[PDB]
């Protein structure tokens, strides 16, 4: 509740920078990579 | 309603520092990973 | 053609420029959202100063050279008739959607995918609203009428008429009942005429069951009233469109008298025509003569001698209103006039409002009719304008409520519920759909935040508290303090917005967002 | 570009700055004229052949052109004083300017919409009016003379009317209907039965 | 003492050609988002401040009218294509822009424009030959000018109520368009009537026009129900014992005079009814009710009559039978009489329905639908309307080629293959033209939000083997056989578009200098 929820949401959104940078440097589509990772995480936690 | 006056303007300095730090971070970002781009200085 | 002084944007700055223009347009009325929205000063080119917070009025009077802003304003002009009171909310929602689309594009999402995802999110939000809607008409007729009156009073209270707004709400409800039937549950605003003038007070409002026809009866000696004649069959109206004069040349005329023979011939012709017309009127049995055109001096004298008050220059729509109210028919000519086509009305008398000395003529039925006129008065032009706007808003709200029994509650509670549902559904759909749903939910979050800001509350804390209350405990109608309220949970405060109104707001916002996003190239020529 | 004909909406910051400061500046035109010991102000025409000096706040406000829309709005709203009382326009303008200045100072200390400021001003005005009503005194001593004057006025007004049938009776009725109320004299407190 | 150039000169040679190429590139970029049904719209504000948002290429070109001479030539060619064909204007502009882009590097390398134009002409010839080869016109492959229409109708009715029974409705839909002028097709010429009763598979196809019962006066079922040599004649206002039109109110104070007047009018009507027979009108139709006297006379004379015919039905019947409408009986002429092979009343649905059959020369037809409920017949009618529209569109251009870039991919592949056997300088131009032809699928994918690079690579890999109908699927991002999905474009339209684009390219590239005179 309060500003804490918004700041935590912003922190979580910022946490996705690392995979985005890895996808960009690897020549892969950032959106595709992040969507596939999130979809696969429905079953896995860290191995994907 | 009534809140803090905020007479001073530390926001200018804070935003300038944030902009400089973000520029440096963006410059360093492209080197992440095995396929990271090389930097020449 | 007109290549010089031609500007265009495409490929690099088109999307950013369009989104920034839309945001700038929205910021004009963003602070005016809600009943306590801040007012804006609008000044005519002649120097007339007016104060109002109506977003539709602010945008309608604003002209600009920006193409995206012009398109947004034009769309809002058309939407003003569809909803009226939701223009500011739709504009704000569209601006928030465009702001989110900016970030989505910055992430590499094509505009078409953004539009499709926004459409899907709007569908999901409408489904959630339908699921969470409540029925008032299906619960109790007394409660339904109470809610209609409450909505009318809420609409009226934002203006100066709040002192005695009950009369306006009652008149609006009576007009809706008289004009609207339950077969279609749609109010025909064309049959609800809005008329008024500066003067009097807010208590002079009156609902008329027919046309006004504030005419001077042409001849000074012509009687200004048509009495029921002590219990007679009301007043018989001669609905005519042919002018009450003989045919005349259109080139020279100058039918002067030079000798006895010409005088005799011209008098014979003119008197024969006038006598034919007046005899037809008398045989028809009409008590009052109504013509689409004026009357000649001889016609006026004959009507005065026969005690036949005359009405001059009645418009086609006025003639249709006369026919509807009096159950009559329009007769093209005098020769076609008969008792079988005359209309009947209770009386045609002069009515005084407050201190007004005009003594305007009004046609009254005193019975249920399919056409009515909402008469509005006030001590100032601003009062009259605000009263008319509030009456229009109340009529639209009543029409929406009657059309669909499902209703939602204001104060952003519906927006918060839709945002929560969209956020929950976003994690279930993979791909660009997740980003689109998250953006749509964030855009929906804008409305409650704007309302809180306009009310002096912190949008962040207010929105977080609303989400917590609507998620951890249960789904309810909890909004922001738009007005002075003891607490939250509008459900107990009786702040109700029609379900159809909210659905139309969401659909129009989505359509406007698609229209702005789907334009990827703008070309404007010079000016002469 | 928005609107046109030199009538365009100003930036929010500058718009609010104008709305407050320009409206407050109207008081400075009449602040020096407040009270019987006020100063004089010189109004000069373009030709300089019709310049005059006056200490009337209403004349100063209505004669000096005001380009800022906020000043126009303030003057138009304050004009109600002339119709209601016909005097004290200077005091109304000065008080409005001071209230606007205080509200501007509060906003500079809060940077939040003045709706709460409006509510606070409403409450303070209600309290001040209640105190003023409490502090008022009555000079209506010898109410018998006032009743006689009311009877005479009623008789004067009833002339040439249908009520002239019993002038004294109707004058007494009218005088009683006002005197015996011991409060508001509005027509809503007086009922007329027509039979 | 008069100067037109105001002392301003201009260069000539490859520089002006490159400037024209740049102008064409600007025009192509401007019109790029409008390509394809999924393309974006363009907002244009005229000198009068009128704002128009549209996606059609012709409207955009008319509103813009770029003053640049190369852009003027492109606009003129696009307008010519739109006027002569009306389809492919945007594609023509895009192809011309792409060809101009490809020509730029050749000019930069010193290649004369004449060689480029000759190579483009040769590539156009090869592309036309390959499109003609790819064009589908088959009989023995279970498809033809009629069987293909049946397949299209079945596809249109797919996932519908009558999908399982499409085997019979496809024939009706195809015959509806084929039963009238094949060079002039119109949906308004294919009517549908709903008759309750019977199975949906029992629906009847009527070559002529049919309508429900409209006669409800004396003599019903007392007149012939079948005609082998019918004569259809529409008489406007007679068929009554008393005049209906242009009549007057007559008041008579004596019984004898009124009776005499009525008898005279009846005798006049008797003479008119006799003349009706004398005119050889075996079928009498009218939009107004027919009296008992006329029906009795016609029944006694073996003549069929039916009044209260709706205007649309009467007009359709007249057009199908080739007759006309006569104001009076005395003015009936033989040239106004229509004839069909057989006219009869159908008893399906516990009611008699009039229909004209065996009239191949009819300009319109009617479909008779059967079913157990009105809702089922309504669904059948909707499916039949969809199938009729689809088959009409298919028949308007029977010569078809695979759509969704399949034709472009095939032409590009063929040109690339030929370039290996055209050894010489023309190889570069052939390869450039083949690459340019691939712009259409690229821009279509880009406007649709698809991954243009991946889709193009997959399409190129796939087209090298298998069928020649592989293209881009715009419903779900993928590639596949568009022809199997019933997605195609006219071959003639594509050929005309390519010809127009190449003509524009040759015209613009053939200009070395432009001179403008003040005026």
The answer to whether E164 touches E448, Cβ cutoff 8 Å, is no
In this structure, are C73 and C142 located in the same domain?
Answer: no
Q: Mapping DSSP to helix (H, G, I), strand (E, B) and coil, where does residue C408 land?
A: strand
Give how many domains chain C has, as a whole number.
3
Render C343-390 in DSSP notation, one character per residue: EEESEEEEE--TT--S-EEEEE--S--S-EEEEEEESSHHHHHHHHHH
- C422 and C501 share one domain: yes
Calculate the dihedral angle through the C-alpha atoms of C4, C10, C15, C20, rounding to the nearest 10 degrees.
-20
Nearest CA to CA, how far is A25 from chain B (Å)?
6
Query: Are C352 and C267 within one domain?
Result: yes
Do both C230 and C322 map to the same domain? yes
Residues D130 and D132: their CA atoms lie apart, in Å, by 5
E27 closest CA partner among C284, C129, C8: C8
E47 touching C (Cβ < 8 Å): yes
Out of C430, C434, C461, name the one closest to residue A2 (CB): C461
Packed helices E406-419 and E439-447: angle between N→C axes, nearest 10 degrees: 150
> Do C156 and C233 belong together in one domain?
no
Among C343, C369, C395, where does a domain finish? C369
Q: Min CA distance, B38 vs chain A (Å)?
A: 11
Report the first-to-last Cα separation within chain E, whole angstroms.
Answer: 15
Q: Which residues contact E325 (CB under 8 A, 6 or more apart)?
A: E234, E235, E236, E314, E318, E336
Neighbours of C197 (CB within 10 A): 16
Query: Does B5 contact D108 at a Cβ distance shorter than 8 Å?
Result: yes
Identify all chain C residues contacting E63, using CB atoms and an 8 Å cutoff: 523
The CATH number that applies at residue C176 is 3.30.260.10
Chain D residues within an 8 Å CB radius of C64: 1-3
| Cα–Cα dist E481/E468, whole Å | 8
Spatial CA neighbour of E209 closest among E239, E238, E230: E230
Q: Is C337 left (phi over 0), alpha (psi -120 to 50) or beta?
A: beta
Contact indicator for C496, C153 with CB cutoff of 8 Å: no
By C-alpha distance, the chain B residue nearest D117 is B1
The strand pairing partners of C372, in sequence order, are C192
DSSP of chain A, one letter per residue?
Answer: -THHHHHHHHHHHHHTHHHHHHHHHTT--HHHHHHHHHHHTTT-SS--
Region at A2 (left for phi over 0; alpha for psi -120 to 50; beta for the rest): left
Contact C168, C156 (CB under 8 A): yes
d(CA C89, CA C32): 10
Kindly report the number of other CB atoms within 10 A of residue D41's CB atom: 19
Q: Which of C52, C57, C80, C88 is catalytic?
A: C88
Do C239 and C318 lie in one domain? The reply is: yes
Distance separating alpha carbons of residues C399 and C408, to the nearest angstrom: 15
Structure tokens at E447: 């406007």
Q: What is the rounded CA–CA span in Å between residue E36 and residue E445? A: 9
Out of A1, A31, A35, closest to residue C464 by CB: A1
> In b/e form, how buried is each residue of E397-431, taking b as 16+ CB within 10 angstroms?
ebbbbbbbbbbbbbbbbbbeebbeebeeebebbbb
Give the residue from C405, C428, C450 where a domain finishes. Answer: C405
Spatial distance between the Cα atoms of C405 and C141, rounded to a whole number of angstroms: 11
C88 is catalytic: yes
For the beta carbon of residue E281, count every other beta carbon within 10 angstroms: 26
Residue contact A2–C464, C-beta within 8 A: yes
- Active site includes C280? no
- Is C399 in the same domain as C520? no
Q: To the nearest whole angstrom, how far is the Cα of D120 from the nearest Cα of chain C?
A: 13
E158-176 burial, b for 16+ CB within 10 Å, e for fewer?
eebbbeebbeebbbbbbbb
CA torsion, ordered E292, E298, E302, E305, to nearest 10 deg: -80
To the nearest 10 degrees (0 to 180), the angle between helices D115-135 and D89-110 is 140
State the resolution, in angstroms.
Answer: 4.6
Same domain, residue pair C178 and C110? no
Please name the residues between 8 and 47 in chain C that touch chain D, using a CB distance below 8 Å.
Answer: 27-28, 31, 36, 38, 40-41, 43-45
- DSSP element (H, E) containing D84: helix D80-84
CA atoms within a 13 Å half-sphere pointing along the CA-CB vector of C168: 35
At residue D157, φ and ψ (nearest 5 deg) are: -75, -30
Q: Does B39 touch chain D (CB under 8 A)?
A: no
| CA distances to C59, C168, C172, C279 from C87, in Å | 9, 23, 22, 56
C278, C306 in Cβ contact below 8 A? yes
Question: By C-alpha distance, which of C380, C495, C391, C397 is closest to C165?
Answer: C391
Q: List, in sequence order, every residue forming a beta bridge with E45; answer none if it has no partner.
A: C524, E51
CB contact under 8 A, C519 and E40: yes
Q: Which residue has the tokens 């009719």?
A: C369
CA distance B1 to chain D (A): 5
Say which CATH number the domain at C20 has.
1.10.560.10
The conformation of residue C199, written as its DSSP 8-state character, comes to B
End-to-end CA distance of chain D: 67
What is the DSSP annotation of E222-256?
-S-SEESS--EEEE-S--SSS--SS------SSHH
Classify burial at C331, counting beta carbons within 10 Å of its beta carbon; exposed 0-12, middle 13-18, buried 19 or more. Answer: buried
Please tell me whether residues C10 and C126 are part of one structural domain. Answer: yes
Task: Answer yes or no: do C292 and C364 share one domain.
Answer: yes
Regarding beta strands E232-235 and E283-285, do their DSSP bridges make them parallel or antiparallel, or are they unpaired?
parallel
Q: How far apart are CA E119 and CA E115, in angstroms?
A: 6
State how far the Cα of E143 lies from the Cα of E155, in Å rounded to an integer. 14
Query: Which residues on chain B are in Cβ contact (under 8 Å) with D109?
Result: 2, 5
Distance between CA D55 and CA C105 in Å, rounded? 65
Calculate helix-pair angle for A3-15, A17-25, nearest 10 degrees: 20
Contacts for D105-112: CB closer than 8 Å, 24+ residues apart? D106/B2, D107/D16, D107/D20, D108/B5, D109/B2, D109/B5, D110/B1, D110/B2, D110/B3, D110/B5, D111/B3, D111/B5, D111/B6, D112/B1, D112/B2, D112/B3, D112/C456
Q: Is D54 exposed, middle or buried (0-12, 13-18, 19+ CB in 10 A)?
A: middle
C67/E43 touch (CB, cutoff 8 Å), yes or no = yes
CB contact under 8 A, C460 and A2: yes
Q: Which CATH number does the domain housing residue C267 bear?
A: 3.50.7.10
Main-chain dihedrals φ then ψ at residue C91, nearest 5 degrees: -60, -45
Q: Look up the domain containing C514 and give its range.
A: 1-136+406-527
Please tell me what DSSP assigns to residue E308: -
Compute the nearest-CA separation of A44 from chain C (Å): 16
Give the up-direction half-sphere exposure of residue C511: CA atoms within 13 A in the CB hemisphere: 12
In the listed set C379, C405, C431, which residue is the last one of a domain according to the structure? Answer: C405
Residues C102, C120: Cα–Cα separation, whole Å: 18
Cβ contacts of D123 on chain C, cutoff 8 Å: none
Distance, in Å, from the CA atom of D107 to the CA atom of D19, rounded to the nearest integer, reads 13
Nearest to E438 by CA among E22, E24, E31, E94: E94
């Amino acid at each position: 509740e309060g500003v804490q929820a918004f700041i935590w949401q912003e922190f979580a959104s910022a946490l996705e920078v690392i995979p985005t940078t890895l996808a960009e440097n690897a020549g892969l589509n950032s959106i595709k990579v992040v969507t596939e990772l999130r979809s696969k995480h429905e079953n896995g936690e860290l191995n994907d | 309603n009534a809140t803090f006056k905020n007479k001073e303007k530390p926001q200018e300095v804070r935003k300038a520092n944030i902009i400089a730090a973000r520029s440096v971070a963006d410059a360093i970002r492209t080197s992440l990973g095995p396929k990271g781009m090389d930097k020449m200085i | 053609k007109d290549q010089g002084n031609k500007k265009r944007q495409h490929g690099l700055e088109a999307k950013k420029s369009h989104i920034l223009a839309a945001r700038s347009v929205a910021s004009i009325i963003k602070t005016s959202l809600g009943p306590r929205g801040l007012d804006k000063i609008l000044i005519s080119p002649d120097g007339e100063i007016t104060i109002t917070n109506d977003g539709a009025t602010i945008l309608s009077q604003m002209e600009l050279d920006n193409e995206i802003a012009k398109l947004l304003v034009q769309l809002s002009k058309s939407q003003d008739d569809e909803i009226g009171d939701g223009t500011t909310g739709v504009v704000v929602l569209a601006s928030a959607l465009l702001d989110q689309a900016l970030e989505l594009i910055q992430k590499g999402i094509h505009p078409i995918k953004i539009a499709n995802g926004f459409d899907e999110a709007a569908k999901l939000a409408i489904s959630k609203l339908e699921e969470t809607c409540d029925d008032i008409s299906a619960s109790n007729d007394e409660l339904f009428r109470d809610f209609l009156l409450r909505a009318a009073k809420t609409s009226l209270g934002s203006k100066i008429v709040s002192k005695d707004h009950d009369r306006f709400a009652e008149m609006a409800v009576e007009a809706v009942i008289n004009v609207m039937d339950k077969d279609r549950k749609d109010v025909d605003f064309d049959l609800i005429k809005m008329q008024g003038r500066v003067g009097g007070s807010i208590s002079d409002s009156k609902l008329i069951n027919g046309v006004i026809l504030d005419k001077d009866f042409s001849h000074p000696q012509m009687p200004k009233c048509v009495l029921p004649k002590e219990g007679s069959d009301g007043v018989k109206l001669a609905i005519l469109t042919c002018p009450f004069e003989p045919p005349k040349p259109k080139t020279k005329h100058k039918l002067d008298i030079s000798s006895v023979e010409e005088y005799q011939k011209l008098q014979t012709y003119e008197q024969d025509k006038f006598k034919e017309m007046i005899d037809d009127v008398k045989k028809a049995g009409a008590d009052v003569v109504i013509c689409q055109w004026g009357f000649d001096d001889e016609a006026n004298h004959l009507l005065l001698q026969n005690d036949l008050p005359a009405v001059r220059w009645v418009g086609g729509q006025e003639l249709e209103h006369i026919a509807i109210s009096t159950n009559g028919r329009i007769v093209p000519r005098f020769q076609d006039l008969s008792k079988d086509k005359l209309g009947t009305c209770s009386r045609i008398y002069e009515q005084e409002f407050g201190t007004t000395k005009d003594r305007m003529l009004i046609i009254e039925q005193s019975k249920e009719t399919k056409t009515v006129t909402c008469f509005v008065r006030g001590s100032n032009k601003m009062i009259v304008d605000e009263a008319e706007r509030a009456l229009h808003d109340s009529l639209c709200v009543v029409r929406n409520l009657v059309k669909d029994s499902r209703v939602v509650y204001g104060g952003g509670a519906a927006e918060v519920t839709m945002s929560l549902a969209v956020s929950e559904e976003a994690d279930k759909q993979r791909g660009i759909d997740q980003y689109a749903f998250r953006g749509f939910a964030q855009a929906l979050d804008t409305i409650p935040m704007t309302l809180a800001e306009n009310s002096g509350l912190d949008p962040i804390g207010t929105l977080s508290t609303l989400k917590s209350k609507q998620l951890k405990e249960k789904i309810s109608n909890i909004g922001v303090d738009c007005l002075g309220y003891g607490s939250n949970d509008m459900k107990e405060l009786f702040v109700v917005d029609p379900f159809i109104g909210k659905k139309q707001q969401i659909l129009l916002a989505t359509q406007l967002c698609r229209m702005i996003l789907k334009i990827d190239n703008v070309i404007i020529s010079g000016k002469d | 570009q928005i609107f046109g004909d030199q009538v365009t909406e100003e930036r929010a910051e500058n718009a609010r700055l104008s709305a407050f400061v320009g409206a407050i500046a109207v008081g400075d035109l009449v602040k020096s004229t407040l009270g019987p010991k006020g100063m004089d102000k010189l109004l000069q025409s373009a030709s300089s052949n019709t310049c005059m000096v006056t200490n009337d706040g209403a004349t100063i406000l209505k004669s000096i052109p005001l380009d800022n829309p906020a000043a126009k709005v303030l003057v138009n709203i304050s004009k109600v004083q002339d119709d209601e009382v016909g005097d004290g326009t200077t005091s109304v303008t000065v008080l409005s300017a001071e209230l606007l200045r205080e509200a501007e100072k509060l906003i500079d200390q809060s940077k939040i919409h003045p709706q709460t400021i409006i509510e606070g001003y409403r409450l303070a005005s209600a309290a001040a009016l209640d105190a003023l009503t409490k502090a008022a005194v009555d000079n209506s001593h010898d109410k018998t003379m006032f009743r006689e004057d009311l009877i005479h006025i009623a008789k004067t007004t009833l002339s040439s009317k249908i009520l002239s049938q019993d002038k004294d009776h109707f004058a007494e009725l009218a005088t009683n209907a006002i005197l015996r109320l011991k409060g508001s004299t509005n027509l809503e407190h007086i009922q007329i039965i027509k039979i | 003492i008069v100067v037109l150039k105001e002392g301003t000169d201009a260069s000539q040679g490859k520089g002006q050609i490159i400037s024209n190429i740049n102008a064409c590139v600007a025009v192509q970029e401007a019109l790029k988002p409008t390509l394809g049904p999924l393309g974006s719209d363009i907002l244009i504000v005229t000198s009068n401040q009128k704002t128009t948002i549209s996606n059609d290429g012709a409207t955009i070109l008319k509103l813009l009218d770029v003053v640049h001479p190369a852009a003027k030539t492109l606009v003129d060619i696009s307008r010519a294509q739109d006027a002569e064909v009306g389809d492919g204007t945007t594609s023509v502009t895009i192809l011309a822009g792409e060809l101009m882009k490809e020509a730029k590097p050749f000019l930069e390398e010193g290649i004369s424009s004449h060689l480029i134009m000759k190579g483009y002409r040769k590539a156009v010839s090869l592309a036309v030959e390959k499109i003609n080869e790819l064009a589908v016109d088959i009989t023995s492959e279970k498809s033809s000018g009629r069987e293909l229409l049946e397949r299209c109708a079945r596809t249109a009715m797919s996932s519908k109520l009558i999908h399982n029974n499409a085997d019979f409705f496809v024939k009706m839909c195809v015959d509806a368009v084929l039963s009238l002028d094949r060079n002039d097709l119109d949906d308004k010429l294919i009517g549908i009537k709903k008759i309750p009763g019977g199975a949906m598979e029992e629906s009847l196809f009527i070559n002529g026009v049919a309508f429900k019962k409209t006669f409800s006066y004396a003599g019903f079922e007392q007149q012939p129900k079948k005609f082998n040599n019918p004569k259809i004649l529409s008489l406007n206002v007679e068929l009554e014992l008393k005049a209906e039109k242009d009549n007057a109110e007559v008041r008579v104070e004596h019984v004898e005079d009124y009776q005499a007047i009525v008898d005279a009018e009846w005798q006049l009507i008797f003479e008119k009814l006799r003349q009706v027979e004398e005119t050889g009108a075996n079928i009498v139709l009218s939009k107004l009710p027919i009296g008992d006297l006329a029906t009795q006379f016609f029944a006694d004379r073996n003549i069929f009559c039916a009044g209260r015919v709706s205007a649309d039905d009467m007009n359709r019947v007249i057009q199908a039978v080739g007759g006309s409408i006569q104001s009076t009986t005395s003015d009936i002429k033989p040239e106004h009489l229509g004839t069909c092979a057989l006219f009869e009343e159908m008893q399906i649905g516990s009611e008699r329905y009039n229909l004209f059959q065996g009239c191949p020369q009819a300009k319109t037809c009617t479909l008779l639908l059967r079913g157990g409920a009105e809702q089922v017949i309504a669904e059948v009618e909707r499916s039949l309307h969809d199938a009729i529209m689809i088959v009409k569109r298919a028949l308007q251009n029977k010569l078809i080629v695979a759509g969704g870039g399949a034709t472009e991919m095939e032409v590009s592949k063929c040109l690339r293959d030929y370039s290996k056997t055209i050894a010489g300088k023309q190889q570069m131009i052939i390869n450039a033209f083949a690459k340019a032809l691939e712009v259409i699928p690229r821009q279509l994918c880009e406007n649709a939000g698809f991954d243009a690079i991946e889709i193009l690579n997959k399409l190129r890999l796939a087209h090298s083997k298998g069928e020649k109908w592989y293209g881009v699927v715009f419903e779900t991002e993928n590639i596949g056989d568009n022809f199997a999905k019933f997605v195609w474009e006219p071959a003639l339209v594509k050929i005309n578009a390519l010809n127009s684009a190449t003509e524009a390219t040759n015209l613009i590239l053939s200009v070395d200098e432009t001179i403008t005179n003040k005026g």
